[PDB]
Write a protein that binds this DNA or RNA. Structure first.
Length: 208
RNA sequence: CUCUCU
RNA sequence: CUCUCU
């Protein structure tokens, strides 16, 4: 009789097979915002411009499971994303400053995101995609009237909005749909006014 | 000059 | 049509 495949037992891999995307319209940064709220990309391999495919490396297999749970089938920019638990474990990283520039993005020392093992404070603000938003790291350099233009730029129905007088880094906001709220996260998370002064974006725990 | 719930 | 194109 023929031989078997001993590598077929390869589960809990911490990588994701990320497939069926439109690489014409979704960047390593858009991926990084999404997968990095859910579970923290250490790397983003993209194969080439018409493979329609990527091979993501996340912090842990349970965090990869949660990212998959929110992103397998996701509606962004055109095509529905496809995902599975992969078969790999690491990516090689090409060179010191070549092709890692967009096709093997090193987030192992990210400029602005990280996670740890479960039970850390890092997990406290992960919420499922909802029409209601919770917004943070907001500088004195903007007001209510500016933040309306940010979320209106999405197209764009701002339902609701209350600034946080109690703790002035923050606001609560709401949109007319979940897809508006999702694309407002994809847009405005890390919209930079300065070196630490940028928008930070989650879905809400609670209502306005 | 760093993280996120009213 | 589902994975390392340096």
């Amino acid at each position: 009789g023929r031989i078997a495949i001993p590598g077929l037992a390869g589960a809990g891999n911490s990588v994701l097979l990320v497939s069926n995307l439109n690489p014409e319209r979704v960047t390593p940064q858009s991926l990084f915002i999404l997968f990095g709220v859910y579970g923290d990309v250490q790397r983003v391999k993209i194969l080439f411009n018409k493979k329609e495919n990527a091979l993501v490396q996340m912090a842990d297999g349970n965090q990869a499971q949660l990212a998959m749970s929110h992103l397998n089938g996701h509606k962004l920019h055109g095509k529905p994303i496809r995902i599975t638990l992969s078969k790999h474990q690491n990516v090689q990283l090409p060179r010191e400053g070549q092709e890692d520039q967009g096709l093997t993005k090193d987030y192992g020392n990210s400029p602005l995101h990280r996670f740890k093992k479960p039970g850390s404070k890092n997990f406290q603000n992960i919420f499922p995609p909802s029409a209601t938003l919770h917004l943070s790291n907001i500088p004195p350099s903007v007001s209510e009237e500016d933040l309306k233009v940010l979320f209106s730029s999405n197209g764009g129905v701002v339902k609701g909005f209350k600034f946080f007088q109690k703790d002035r880094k923050m606001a609560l906001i709401q949109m007319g749909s979940v897809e508006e709220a999702v694309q407002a996260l994809i847009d405005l998370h890390n919209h930079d006014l300065g070196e630490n002064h940028h928008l930070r974006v989650s879905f809400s725990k609670s209502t306005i």
